[PDB]
Amino acid sequence: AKPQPIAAANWKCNGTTASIEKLVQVFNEHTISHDVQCVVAPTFVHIPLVQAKLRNPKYVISAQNAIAKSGAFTGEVSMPILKDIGVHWVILGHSERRTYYGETDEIVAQKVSEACKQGFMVIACIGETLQQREANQTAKVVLSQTSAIAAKLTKDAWNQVVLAYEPVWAIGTGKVATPEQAQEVHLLLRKWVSENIGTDVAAKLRILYGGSVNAANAATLYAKPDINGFLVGGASLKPEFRDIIDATR
Amino acid sequence: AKPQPIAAANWKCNGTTASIEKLVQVFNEHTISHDVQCVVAPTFVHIPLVQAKLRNPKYVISAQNAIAKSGAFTGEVSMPILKDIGVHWVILGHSERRTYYGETDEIVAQKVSEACKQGFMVIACIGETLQQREANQTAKVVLSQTSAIAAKLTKDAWNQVVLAYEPVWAIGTGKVATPEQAQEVHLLLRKWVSENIGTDVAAKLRILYGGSVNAANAATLYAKPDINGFLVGGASLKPEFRDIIDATR
Structure with missing residues (x-):
C-alpha cells in the first residue's frame, strides 16, 4: 500500500495579504475526507498570516528555504528561528x-x-535539466543528487525526508511530465532507496512529482504506483489546488 | 545643520518570539525626546511580530534584503510583497x-x-575590506560602490537614499572605526554626492556609520560633523540600543 500522500503548495515569491486571505478561505472551506498531508509554503513574511488564518486540519505550513544556523547572515532565515515560530517543514x-x-x-x-x-520534515527537491534528459543522464543525475543527500543522513533521519522529483524542464513551462515519464523516475528512485537505505524506508518514503501539475493532469499521475503526491507551483496559487488534493484519493 | 539622524537596528539572522517580545518592550518603554528616525530590521518571518508589538512612535520597520519582482523565486521575498505588508524600508x-x-x-x-x-526608503551599504584599506584604496572603493548605485538613480530618488558606511573589518570584529577614521570617509562621500548629485542632496543625505557601534563609542562618533547616525548589528539585540539612540541627541 502507498504511504500517506502529500499535496504541497509552493507559493514561491507571490502573494498579497488580500490574495492570501481569499485563497486560505477557499482552502479552509474545502473539506477533505481522506488521509493526506497538505502543505502550504508561503514566503517568509507571509508565514504568520497563514498561521493565523489557515485552519483546515489536513494542513501544515512549510518554509521555502532556510539556512542552518542563526547569526550574522543579513537577509536570511535560520532553521532555529523557523522551529521557534512553529514551522517544522521546509523545502530544500x-x-x-x-x-x-x-x-x-x-x-x-x-x-x-x-x-x-x-x-524538520524536509521536502528535498531533485531533478534533471532538459540537456541532461536529452543526454540520457536522468537516472545518473537524480541518483547523484539523492546520494549526495543520503551521505549526510543516518537511516533514522529518513523518517523526516520527502523527495520531490521536479524535472527542471517541467517547472513553470506548461509541459508536465507524462505519467510514464514520472513513474519511471520514481521507480528507480525508490529502488535506490530500498537497496541503499532500507526496504522499510523505501516502503514508507513519499516521492512527490512536481512541474506543471494541475487539476486536470493530477489524478492520472497519482494513479502510478510510485507517485505519492505533488509539489505544486503555479496551480497552488489558485482554487484548483483543491482538485489536486482530491486527486490523491 | 545636520539632517535628522537615524539609529537602525540590523538584527541579522537572530531572534525568538520570546526574545523579540522582551526587547521590543524595552524599546517601547524608552521614551525618546529628540528628532530621530529609529529603524528595526528583523528577519522576514519576525516582521509581523514586530509590527504587532513595536509601538514607540520614533520607529519604523525595515527588511534586511529583498528581490525586485515577485514570481518563481523559491525562498525569496520581493519588494512588492514587502510594500503590501506595510514595510517600506529596506537594507540593501x-x-x-x-x-x-x-x-x-x-x-x-x-x-x-x-x-x-x-x-522604499533604502539603507544602501558600502564599505572597504581590510585588504583594500591597507592598499590605500578606501576612497576608491567606497566611491566606486556609491557611483555604481548613483548611475541607476534619478536625482529625485536620492530623497529615499540613506548611505551606511560599514568598513568590513569593523563588522562584528570588536574593532570599531575611530571617529577620525569614520569622519574622513563620510566627508569624502558627502563631497562626492555634493559634486555629482547636488549640493541640496548632499546637505540632506544621511550617511550612517556601522561596524562595532556600541553604547560607549556612539556619542563620540556622532559628534563628528558628517556622521548622521548608525547601523547597529550586535548591540541592537541588546538594551544598550537605547543608549545608541540617545547618542544621536
Missing part, C-alpha cells in the same frame, strides 16, 4: 535555488542534514 | 550579502534602483 534544494542562488549538491545535502537534525 | 547591499550571497556592485545598484522606484 528547489531548482530555482540550485540554479539562481548557488545551491550545489553539497550545499543542499548539508542543509537537509541540518534540517533533519533540527527536527 | 549589506557586506554579508556582497560577500556570501553574490551581490556585486551591479546587483546592489539594480536592487537600490528598483526599491526607490517602488517607494
